[model samples]
Target: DNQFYSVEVGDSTFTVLKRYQNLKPIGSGAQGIVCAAYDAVLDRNVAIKKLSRPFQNQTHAKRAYRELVLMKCVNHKNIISLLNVFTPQKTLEEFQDVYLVMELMDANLCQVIQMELDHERMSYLLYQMLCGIKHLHSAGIIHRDLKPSNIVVKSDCTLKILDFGLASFMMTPYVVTRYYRAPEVILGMGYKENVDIWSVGCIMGEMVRHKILFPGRDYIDQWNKVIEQLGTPCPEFMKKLQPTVRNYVENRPKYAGLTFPKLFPDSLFPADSEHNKLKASQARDLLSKMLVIDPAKRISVDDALQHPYINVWYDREHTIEEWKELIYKEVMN
Candidate 1:
């Protein structure tokens, strides 16, 4: 009867499957509420994202369908998998709630960063984040909202990028999110397909520092925050700004002497507590390039994938595997 029972949506009805009071509500957003739910068929706990009916316009409905289609198209190990989608045969009268069933993750990168993993775990955490983003790149999908909150880390240390609501086809580039948003978006400049790189930079800095690198409380503050750290944009990037953006920069405070090393001593000489001196310096150099406020000058994500830090983890794959085997042998023996 629960399956037959429907939630009303104006003149339509959406069937309800099984609802358990034991499962808890974890989060809520503009469009929907996320609940920790029990899947009877799956025989495990899963996160269910249910869409509220009021926000269900034709455009929103199309986006919901598109997100489902995109999830199905992507099948990477690093990307969160969409377990199932439930649609009712008919809409319930006066109410409508649609649900998406997905693998429940413990916490997101934002929480992890706030918790401050030990120095020994920093490299591993950063590497997993990169790996997740790498997998997305390989799939020809751009995660327009690549922030700490959008990344989920499982208990096994595996990282998964979530909230594909802003994702688009490989060639389609749309600007989403402020501050971490690429310069092309800030300047009203048209870009090819490298906007995500800009976001990756922001996230990397935020994670490494355990705080938002460019926390612009507002649009003006955001611009000021970035410009203060990275200095004014070059002509190429400046020309792309919208009229409002252009006006904002016209008489704003400027930092002529700002440099990565000068602004963030730890960025260049990361505290001894963060990493070895050599590794810290290396990380700073890589992050500096990645966090370039001017999208034109920023390092490409592909280039970042080849950074020395990545090389360290990727190069040790064989050694790591062998080490694990050795440990297993020792335990077995």
Candidate 2:
């Protein structure tokens, strides 16, 4: 029992030589846990993520494996790379677990965005996030969970999307983290790739404003928050609404649409808050489209790539590729 032990992966465990040193564990979640490890051979830091037993059913295991495969499919400088993956052979003594070794990031976007950074720096961070999401969608994948916590920031102030644990192929109905969830999920409408775009809008607001754009306590509350901000569902949603849901929406009280000028009075901005310029006005417009209550009218990634907010914040480029490359150089270097 005192001797070095082998870690099991799936049905088997292979003994491994201990050449690397283990550091303190940093974070944990439903799918698994991550440990900070020092790779003696590579002489650098790396994060080791192992599947938890609770999420180890055959179906969930397959999903976990699929997530890794998807990660490999969308490999890019802005997305976290799968450095190493290990699965067990047929015979093993310990518990079944699969491990994924990935690039270690210093802090998540949830943590980093809380820092006291200028609007310029915040814009840079949002640009990186959009670039990464754009790459994912281009690869036929959707990062279902696009919240700040799932995004990690490197020491150089660049952000990368991590935790593909919830990512899936386009057009799949996947529920995302609550606050940033798209309207389709809440309304039970089948989801499309554009779901990630909605989340991007939430994250962008959180980054600049230092608060959650849509802060709701529960699923119902969240749905109301979205509807209130962008008005009720549009004709497309009305056409596709399920019978029970249609009845619910019909009975629901109408919510007045949010007018940015009304909600955030100009007085809210500091007298000389350089941010209150024309760019701010454009940013508000983009935010409205992004957070629209109607899934059909919600901003698309392509359109968002061309939006004035992105242009104003990210140097007038309408494409996400240029944004990604520039950001990659900033953080990786």
Candidate 3:
């Protein structure tokens, strides 16, 4: 293999250059597998993500190529960037595998959340998440999926978002039933600017309470859980709600509307001695604002950064033309 070497990582085999060695499995999921390895040439540890299956079809190849180019093109302190991408195959006809090397951070938010986080740490981490998100959204790049596992932090609390974009080989789910999803579908609203804030709101609350804000079994039940706890949206905001969804929500029993304070009680906090001043009030207020049913009433990146909590802190086959257009149009330069 000349400059390349063969290594076994978990159930898979990796054919990498001699410069990369000591590989072992770190994590994996439906998207693909990853490994922690020593990059002797770079003199630091790194992660290598082996995309699941790029040669499955033409569409798959296109997404894989785009994701590769996406990593090579992006740079942001709070977002994961590709350090190196290599293909072992010598001929284009046999170029079936793609490997991406990236900076490895200490822990993902899911791992970190197990330990109770103090207000200062939580706020700063959330702030970094906002910073990275604003960086992307400001450029009009939309990251359709974001979850606690996608956010990571270092020992020093430096945070960076992983898998924010780069569009994977797996077709994006048609309808998401994840914990991080918002009620935009129920409201007949688009998934754009403020829609992400709803997820951030869900995240921040989880940081404090260590429980998912609304764990809905599916789309319809999720909305019920949200309105049941947050109370029905005001009549003005409900105007956009679909005829069916609107009537359903209107007919449902009204929630007493658990006040933010009652929902996110001080007991859930780590007993701040700073002490409990702006920490508690600011958090709950920000939650109330973000979890708003009307996305138009939701927070923006700039406004969210200025807000107290922050202060403390894509498409279908037609999309093919869109991203391929983006890839070619930008790469020509």
Candidate 4:
């Protein structure tokens, strides 16, 4: 019979459920330690995340509940599935541990991004990401943090979005990470679903460049880096900003910005071929819209899904049906 065992990971000891055996530490972060475990009952491999200090404070508690609720609610092929949730503690007074079982993935995008990817693979991956984001958006949720590290991929080229602890319906300036953050977030302006599109654009750009597009030392530097590469925001966008912010931005030296061709040059992209449907020009066009300094001008998730570079994989009926079924399952469960 499978039985619980005391496992010492780093400085802490965890008493995991008996059904999960042969645990091996895989990853750890500010959230918690994750381990790869074999499920005896399900007869498959799974990733178990042990949330760190879930009830340590009001903020941690809220994040813990949000992560659990969102993971349990949202279901899609491009989104990581929450397999099972458990607590080793038997009563409320002793409830400190929370474990989330998830479908084990081959690797995160961080590792995959290190290798050279062709246009087809890149476009397909982007398509799947948009599909996942579209699903979330349909449900009125926003994945504030969108980075290569938070995305996971399978050996078969399947991509799944992960880490929804920071997701929210309300727009917040501190939501996304600095490198992938949108201009509206940096300038303390109101944001919406389009804010997420900016992050996706940054990820797409990184996929092509093989490095971070905006590597800023801090928040201020982050805005500077964005404008330096993409050029300063137009006067219309500046007028919406607070006076202090607008004044500071106006005082900064203006940049003419790099054209899409120069920013994402043909040389930096994979060679176009008769067999491949994706084109460098189409991708640049999509990126240009998504990376706009003004959120109002950003490409919407719906429009992005219809873009020539991404629409090759678009199956509206199938996608809608798939999401409907998943939502139905979540309701039934």
Model 2 residue 96 CA deviation in Å:
1.1
TM-score of 2: 0.78
Misplaced by over 4 Å in model 2 are 1-19, 87-95, 165-176, 264-276, 312-333
* Tens digits of lDDT, candidate 4, 4-123: 566876666766788888888878755677888889899999998887446554454556666677887778999898888876655444556677889898898878778888777888
Best-to-worst TM-score order: 4, 3, 2, 1
**Candidate 3 C-alpha lDDT tens digits along 143-252:** 65568888878999988887654233346553343667766744545677666777778888888878878887776677778877788778876677778877876887
lDDT (Cα, 0-100) at 197 in candidate 4: 90
Candidates in order, TM-scores: namely: 0.76, 0.78, 0.85, 0.88
Pairs clashing within candidate 4: none
Runs of candidate 3 with Cα error greater than 4 angstroms are 57-66, 165-177, 185-188, 244-253, 272-274, 312-333
Worst 10 residues of 3 by lDDT: 314-323
Best by lDDT: 4
**Which ten residues in a row are the worst by lDDT in model 4?**
316-325
- List CA RMSD, all candidates: 12.5, 9.7, 4.7, 7.5
What are the lDDT scores of the predictions, listed in order?
0.61, 0.64, 0.72, 0.78
Candidate with the greatest TM-score versus the true structure: 4
Full candidate order by lDDT, most accurate first: 4, 3, 2, 1
Candidate 1 lDDT, 1-333, residue by residue in tens? 546344433333334466422355666544456667667777878886666442234444445545656677876666777786654434234224456668888887778777645434555666665666666667666665567767778777677777563532212133334757765655556654457777767766666666787777566677777787778776665566667777667667667637666655764334655446667676667778877666667777667767776556654123333433332232122
lDDT of 1: 0.61
